[PDB]
Paper text:
The HLAI residues that are polymorphic are mainly those forming the peptide-binding groove, which contains six binding pockets (A to F) that define the size and chemical characteristics of the specific peptide repertoire that can be accommodated by each HLAI molecule. Cognate T-cell receptors (TCRs) expressed on [name]+ T-cells detect pathogen-derived peptides presented by HLAI molecules on the surface of infected cells. In this study we focus on two [name]-1-specific epitopes and their presentation by 4 different members of the [name]-B7 superfamily, [name]*07:02, [name]*42:01, [name]*42:02 and [name]*81:01. We show that single polymorphisms between different alleles of the [name]-B7 superfamily can induce a conformational switch in peptide conformation that is associated with differential HLAI-specific escape mutation and immune control.
Numbering used by the authors:
A (entry chain C): 1 to 9
B (entry chain A): 1 to 277
C (entry chain B): 0 to 99
């Protein structure tokens, strides 16, 4: 299962 | 007996043609098992292997929400990257992401990954320590500073050592009959005169899984690296892979050539020669 | 950006046997950017029922796609794959050779 998004670049 | 889970994300901007498209695919080893596409009519995580179909609605819904949020994050990233490189708002650009874990036969973590490319060039990567970053350039150094302040690496480490490994082990258990089965190559050698002086010997490998394979030609026991044409390994469409290796040989000298095949699924490596019938 | 032109292989799923149903594959790989045009051709005409794999990429970030269709090969019908990409000044046509 995928990881959650964290911070944009 | 090691295994890998990987997610591969592609975001591509398209000024004048809407917001950037986001595509995700997920793999265990060489087997794709999920997809998401923001251009679908009703974007949702969808199954792409039979053994994932048993996951309940909560799985599919939560993962869909993740990918939608990821698309939004990647769109912010794309805008930031264009600015970091002083780029025009008129061009199209690509942000790729890859992440996931490798485990051994014991199910223990071997290593994690979490890395990115911008316009096809490496941009930033989580180091093997799962704690520090490598930045490619002064633009990626901006991202590194931001991600250090936000303690991103800690959260990626937690996923890679926890969720990623645990769910990879679940998938290996549930997909065992395919994911833990190596299908050896079916092999043969063909012969085709090209002139009165020379012929091609082509050594074929078909029907194998996983994709990793080694095909080599030897002349008198010496590997013919410079003289072997070797096609990329290619998918058959039935989960299996194909590959060939060819060498051009003097007519009459065919018995001096042997094709050597190495693959997971073989009890022992094969040595093959042209067998005229 | 980096641009990388596609590699192209055209081949069948199973060894071809005239009059027997099979799949015709066009595998495009090693390209960047990801936008690409791929047609499968029978005697020079576009085949309509063509699907492709979901977009993915290799360790070097280059993209790959499998385009495929059911077909029944014959002695005389000619098949090919036609690819267009920003790296190409005109579309590239690769003929199906049942022995490659």
């Amino acid at each position: 299962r995928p990881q959650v998004p964290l911070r944009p670049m | 007996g090691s295994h890998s889970m990987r997610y591969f994300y592609t975001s591509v901007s398209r000024p004048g043609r809407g917001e950037p498209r986001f595509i995700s695919v997920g793999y265990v080893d060489d087997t794709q098992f999920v997809r998401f596409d923001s251009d679908a009519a009703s974007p949702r995580e969808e199954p792409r292997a039979p053994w994932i179909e048993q996951e309940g609605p909560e799985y599919w819904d939560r993962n869909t929400q993740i990918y939608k949020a990821q698309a939004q994050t990647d769109r912010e990233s794309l805008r930031n990257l264009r600015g970091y490189y002083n780029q025009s708002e008129a061009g199209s650009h690509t942000l790729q992401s890859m992440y996931g874990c490798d485990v051994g036969p014991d199910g223990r973590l071997l290593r994690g990954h979490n890395q990115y490319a911008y316009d096809g060039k490496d941009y930033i990567a989580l180091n093997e320590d799962l704690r520090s970053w490598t930045a490619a350039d002064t633009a990626a150094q901006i991202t590194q500073r931001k991600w250090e302040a936000a303690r991103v690496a800690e959260q990626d480490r937690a996923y890679l050592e926890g969720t990623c490994v645990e769910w990879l082990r679940r998938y290996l258990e549930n997909g065992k009959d395919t994911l833990e089965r190596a299908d050896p190559p079916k092999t043969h050698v063909t012969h085709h005169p090209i002139s009165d002086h020379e012929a091609t010997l082509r050594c074929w490998a078909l029907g194998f899984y996983p994709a990793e394979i080694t095909l080599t030609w030897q002349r008198d026991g010496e590997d013919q690296t410079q003289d072997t044409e070797l096609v990329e390994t290619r998918p058959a469409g039935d989960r299996t892979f194909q590959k060939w290796a060819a060498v051009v040989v003097p007519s009459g000298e065919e018995q001096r050539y042997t094709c050597h095949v190495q693959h997971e699924g073989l009890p022992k490596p094969l040595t093959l020669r042209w067998e005229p019938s | 950006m980096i641009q990388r032109t596609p590699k192209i292989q055209v081949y069948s799923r199973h060894p071809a046997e005239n009059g027997k149903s099979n799949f015709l594959n066009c595998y495009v790989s090693g390209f960047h950017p990801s936008d690409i045009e791929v047609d499968l051709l029978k005697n020079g005409e576009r085949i309509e029922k063509v699907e492709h794999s979901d977009l993915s990429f290799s360790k070097d970030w280059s993209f790959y796609l499998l385009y495929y269709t059911e077909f029944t090969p014959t002695e005389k019908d000619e098949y090919a794959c036609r690819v267009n990409h920003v790296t190409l000044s005109q579309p590239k046509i690769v003929k199906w050779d049942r022995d490659m």
